[PDB]
Amino acid sequence: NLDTLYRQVIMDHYKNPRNKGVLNDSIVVDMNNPTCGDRIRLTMKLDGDIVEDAKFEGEGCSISMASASMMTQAIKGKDIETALSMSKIFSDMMQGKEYDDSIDLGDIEALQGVSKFPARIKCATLSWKALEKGV
Amino acid sequence: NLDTLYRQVIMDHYKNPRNKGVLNDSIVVDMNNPTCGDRIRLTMKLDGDIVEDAKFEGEGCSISMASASMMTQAIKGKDIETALSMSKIFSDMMQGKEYDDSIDLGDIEALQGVSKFPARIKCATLSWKALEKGVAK
Amino acid sequence: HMNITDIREQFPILHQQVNGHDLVYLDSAATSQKPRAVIETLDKYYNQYNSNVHRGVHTLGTRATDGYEGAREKVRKFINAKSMAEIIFTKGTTTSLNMVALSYARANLKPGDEVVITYMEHHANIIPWQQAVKATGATLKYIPLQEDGTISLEDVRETVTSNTKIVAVSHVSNVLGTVNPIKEMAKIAHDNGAVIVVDGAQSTPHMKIDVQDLDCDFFALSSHKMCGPTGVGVLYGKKALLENMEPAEFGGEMIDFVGLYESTWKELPWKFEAGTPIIAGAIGLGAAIDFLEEIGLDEISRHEHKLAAYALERFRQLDGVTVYGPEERAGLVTFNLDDVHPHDVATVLDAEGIAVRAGHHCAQPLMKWLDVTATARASFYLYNTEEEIDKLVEALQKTKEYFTN
Amino acid sequence: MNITDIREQFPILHQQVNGHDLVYLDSAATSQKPRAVIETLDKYYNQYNSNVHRGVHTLGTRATDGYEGAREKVRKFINAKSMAEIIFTKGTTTSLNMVALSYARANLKPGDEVVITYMEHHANIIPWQQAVKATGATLKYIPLQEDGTISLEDVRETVTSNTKIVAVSHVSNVLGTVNPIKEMAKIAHDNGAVIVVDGAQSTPHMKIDVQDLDCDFFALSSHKMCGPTGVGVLYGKKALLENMEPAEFGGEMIDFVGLYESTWKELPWKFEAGTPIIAGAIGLGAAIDFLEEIGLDEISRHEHKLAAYALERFRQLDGVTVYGPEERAGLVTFNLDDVHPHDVATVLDAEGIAVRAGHHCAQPLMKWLDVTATARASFYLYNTEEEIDKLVEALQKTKEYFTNV
Numbered sequence A: 001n002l003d004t005l006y007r008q009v010i011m012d013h014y015k016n017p018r019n020k021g022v023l024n025d026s027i028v029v030d031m032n033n034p035t036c037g038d039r040i041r042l043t044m045k046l047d048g049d050i051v052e053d054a055k056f057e058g059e060g061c062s063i064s065m066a067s068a069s070m071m072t073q074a075i076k077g078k079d080i081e082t083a084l085s086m087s088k089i090f091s092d093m094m095q096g097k098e099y100d101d102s103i104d105l106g107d108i109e110a111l112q113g114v115s116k117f118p119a120r121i122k123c124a125t126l127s128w129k130a131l132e133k134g135v
Numbered sequence B: 001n002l003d004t005l006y007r008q009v010i011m012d013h014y015k016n017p018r019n020k021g022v023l024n025d026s027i028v029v030d031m032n033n034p035t036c037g038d039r040i041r042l043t044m045k046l047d048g049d050i051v052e053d054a055k056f057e058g059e060g061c062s063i064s065m066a067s068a069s070m071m072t073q074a075i076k077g078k079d080i081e082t083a084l085s086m087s088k089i090f091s092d093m094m095q096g097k098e099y100d101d102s103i104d105l106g107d108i109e110a111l112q113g114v115s116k117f118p119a120r121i122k123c124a125t126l127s128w129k130a131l132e133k134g135v136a137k
Numbered sequence C: 001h002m003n004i005t006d007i008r009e010q011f012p013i014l015h016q017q018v019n020g021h022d023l024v025y026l027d028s029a030a031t032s033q034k035p036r037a038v039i040e041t042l043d044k045y046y047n048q049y050n051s052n053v054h055r056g057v058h059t060l061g062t063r064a065t066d067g068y069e070g071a072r073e074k075v076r077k078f079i080n081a082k083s084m085a086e087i088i089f090t091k092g093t094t095t096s097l098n099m100v101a102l103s104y105a106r107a108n109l110k111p112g113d114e115v116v117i118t119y120m121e122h123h124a125n126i127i128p129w130q131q132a133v134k135a136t137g138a139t140l141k142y143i144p145l146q147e148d149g150t151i152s153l154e155d156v157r158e159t160v161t162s163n164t165k166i167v168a169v170s171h172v173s174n175v176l177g178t179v180n181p182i183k184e185m186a187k188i189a190h191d192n193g194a195v196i197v198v199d200g201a202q203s204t205p206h207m208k209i210d211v212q213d214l215d216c217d218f219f220a221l222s223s224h225k226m227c228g229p230t231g232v233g234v235l236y237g238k239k240a241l242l243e244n245m246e247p248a249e250f251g252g253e254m255i256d257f258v259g260l261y262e263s264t265w266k267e268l269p270w271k272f273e274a275g276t277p278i279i280a281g282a283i284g285l286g287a288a289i290d291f292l293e294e295i296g297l298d299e300i301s302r303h304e305h306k307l308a309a310y311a312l313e314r315f316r317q318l319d320g321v322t323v324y325g326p327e328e329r330a331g332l333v334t335f336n337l338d339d340v341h342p343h344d345v346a347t348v349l350d351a352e353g354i355a356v357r358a359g360h361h362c363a364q365p366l367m368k369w370l371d372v373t374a375t376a377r378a379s380f381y382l383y384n385t386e387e388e389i390d391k392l393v394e395a396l397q398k399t400k401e402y403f404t405n
Numbered sequence D: 001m002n003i004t005d006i007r008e009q010f011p012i013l014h015q016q017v018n019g020h021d022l023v024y025l026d027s028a029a030t031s032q033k034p035r036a037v038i039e040t041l042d043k044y045y046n047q048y049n050s051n052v053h054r055g056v057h058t059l060g061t062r063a064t065d066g067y068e069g070a071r072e073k074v075r076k077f078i079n080a081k082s083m084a085e086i087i088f089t090k091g092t093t094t095s096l097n098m099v100a101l102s103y104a105r106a107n108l109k110p111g112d113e114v115v116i117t118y119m120e121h122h123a124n125i126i127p128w129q130q131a132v133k134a135t136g137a138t139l140k141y142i143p144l145q146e147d148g149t150i151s152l153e154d155v156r157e158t159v160t161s162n163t164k165i166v167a168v169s170h171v172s173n174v175l176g177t178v179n180p181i182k183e184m185a186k187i188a189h190d191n192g193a194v195i196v197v198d199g200a201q202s203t204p205h206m207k208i209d210v211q212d213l214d215c216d217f218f219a220l221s222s223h224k225m226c227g228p229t230g231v232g233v234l235y236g237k238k239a240l241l242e243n244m245e246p247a248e249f250g251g252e253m254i255d256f257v258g259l260y261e262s263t264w265k266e267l268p269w270k271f272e273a274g275t276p277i278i279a280g281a282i283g284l285g286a287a288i289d290f291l292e293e294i295g296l297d298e299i300s301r302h303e304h305k306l307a308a309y310a311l312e313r314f315r316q317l318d319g320v321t322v323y324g325p326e327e328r329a330g331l332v333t334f335n336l337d338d339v340h341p342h343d344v345a346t347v348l349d350a351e352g353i354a355v356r357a358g359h360h361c362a363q364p365l366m367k368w369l370d371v372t373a374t375a376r377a378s379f380y381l382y383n384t385e386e387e388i389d390k391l392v393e394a395l396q397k398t399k400e401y402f403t404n405v
């Protein structure tokens, strides 16, 4: 049902997000869901080739905010190449596609459920779109 | 055939038109048939409320030019906005309806036939459309 | 009057399932569905008499032309325009409003002039004016709104001045449901030497339009909202104004004489119709008009008022739901559930097969006026029932309970 | 696919007009539609009509996927690099107007030249006329060779360092000439100009590759390529589209709308204001699939064979002058001596045959040919050699009819 979309982990990241804030000397992009209501400002400080920290500020639906939280956390200390690979895996995950389960996504996998609710793809994808324009 | 609603008299006005030429010191209308290819330059020199001479030049199909010819000849010497009455009668005639028959309406009427071939209504109405714009204030 | 069973029977799209529920379509304000009468009109056009219109001497050309011009006449009668010269087929209300901005506004605005609009305006009836004022050095001004989202006549009189050249206003707000006092507004526009431009995309499907009684100078509407095909709409303008406006687009069909460097335009209304026109869409718009007239627009209006009252009452029995706008309204409700984002609301509803809109509904300034980021909106039309309102309200209750366990 | 199979798909072909089989030879004015396209419209209105894009319910998703999937089919069809470069418009006329309004008026000063041809359709003349007039630029005409073709030398003579725009039809709708577009684009580029291609007459009949053509803009109309009326395409190089302002303003083409200022959506939606032509665009996509399944090279071969057969049969009838060269597209423009083409088309229509008579939206071409009007039969994928025979036999009947008076 709806239960396969609003999983416990998703609701938890919506209630208690992980990297809340906008931080310093950094690349900061802000992005909006064309279907109005979802706003993110992603902040990343990049250490040569690795993302030492990512933080976000925003308002929106459960999916968009939770995906921002899960994303920012799953990218701490990962490389740029790895981060884009994560993103492409996420975008396959939103469509039907089979995807490479090499590379742990941890919590992020909980968003699998939105593949069955295509009107929320963009809600889940906003945070990731921010990263792809970040680089 | 059915095509013999291109009457005797119509073919005469196409063969040998009536008021062919240009008129000076005049009301001058220039018109094209929306169904492209028929051109009229209709000129009326009027004596107050009446058309003392009406002339035209153009290029087009048998119907458009013949209707111009018959028109200019049936409108030589015409009286008041009775000319507009003639026009409205003509337009009713094209739509198949009966009208207030015999307020002279010299000749023409063979254009009755193009109540069939509705694709040619505009060909017959060009000349008359010109007249109605002629008297438009 | 209206037998809802018989009405619904004519719309095939309504008889299907979404997620194992009967479809509950409450998004008519975004776009309306079509009866078989209209879709068959398109079919018969493409199956039997498609041809180019006007410039033509063959049989099917005649049929296609009679259909296109006959549809023009149906639109004229529908909105009570004096003359066919005053009815122009366009791609939609957006194009229509843009035509007024491009051909009318840019030739009648100089610096010091004002265009006066409203906070509740759809983007279609905002951005063209924004561009027009910027092109001419004029000024854009906004009529304020009352608490309840209606406009007062006093605030119009205060905002409209002797410098105003254009007042543009939607007949019915697609968010608030308000029916703006267009007739009285037209009079205030005229008293200040201005014209009025009416965005009627949201009124024309749901209430009788009389342009003569309204005395509006321009009126825009979209076929796709009134059970018609997509991609067509109408610009009405008083003949005297259309006579002195240049075309917005140029090409075949709108010309009379073409020389190498200069051309003359066809008489109205063809002046404003460049290129092969929207032949099947215009014929299908005419069929939608016949369908709506046979039911009767006053009957459609009465049906939607009954649904709006029922919806409102049922919504007041729901705590934690804010409805925006006044009591007396058209057949729509825009709302929020407290503490549940409208994307979540729309997901739950669509899981119960209920189709609503979420977001800004093309009225972002209205959203900011309401101090909201986004909203949900259920809209009703002649094929909606009280039962569907019950399903909506029950799903909202489930949404409430679902997010607050 | 045999010709009989192909005709089997077009219901409009299987009917009588004045007791004769319809002989539709007016495809250059507009094309007929296969079942595949009409059923596309049907299924859209019967199953998933809803607004497109910012969307939250199931049918909205299906509608949006249909509209955007059709964009992708157009891009592949004409070999554009990117979806950003494909804009859905009302038709070729609108497309050409958008270029004149947003590109030409931002890139023309006094001294600059727009270069067109004498054979241009009105759609590809009047917008330039208006643009030069608004900017103080100059319109110039490339001459034609006596057989109505274009010489590369005449283009090099006409195009100068002051030229900003060259506009040219890919295929003449009167002469049936295929203009050297590729080589013309090179001459435009060498003189610091862009090229705008009117492709309304090429796109239905031959393969279009905009990357090989290197054209800067390319316009086409759905209604001529077995698609629904009211829809067309503007293609433009991405770098040009980036720096052109929108031609129309309203919802859907925005990112943010404040009271006085707004930001535009990225390409291609920058140029798509308002509820788009939803069913039309999906049906254009179905027409593209249909045409690709047959193959455009095959459609071209078929029309060249009908054009050759027609030409050979034509001058072995005395008393017809045909205009244009031997190698041509699938159309013939002609006159019978001493019989106006309206009379010709009346007699042909009495034998069930549909042709066009008069100007064909190319008045300057008519004056160049020293003629006031012409008749035109055009062919397409559903025409046969048999129908050519019927046309020629009816022309003989027409001759003999007007000699017996």
Ligand SMILES: *Cc1c(COP(=O)(O)O)cnc(C)c1O
Pocket: C252, C274, C275, C276, C277, D028, D091, D092, D093, D094, D121, D123, D124, D169, D171, D172, D173, D198, D200, D201, D221, D223, D224
């Ligand atoms: C048909 C045509 C046009 C105009 O296209 P519409 O679909 O009428 O807007 C322009 N140029 C040529 C060569 C054409 O054949």
Ligand SMILES: *Cc1c(COP(=O)(O)O)cnc(C)c1O
Pocket: C029, C092, C093, C094, C095, C122, C124, C125, C170, C172, C173, C174, C199, C200, C201, C202, C222, C224, C225, C233, D273, D274, D275, D276
């Ligand atoms: C839908 C709507 C528009 C825009 O109409 P389109 O048909 O999308 O161009 C404009 N104004 C109002 C009030 C509307 O409801």
Ligand SMILES: [Zn+2]
Pocket: A033, A037, A038, A060, A061, A063, A064, A122, A123, C343
């Ligand atoms: Zn969201």
Ligand SMILES: [Zn+2]
Pocket: B033, B037, B038, B060, B061, B062, B063, B064, B123, D342
């Ligand atoms: Zn004629």
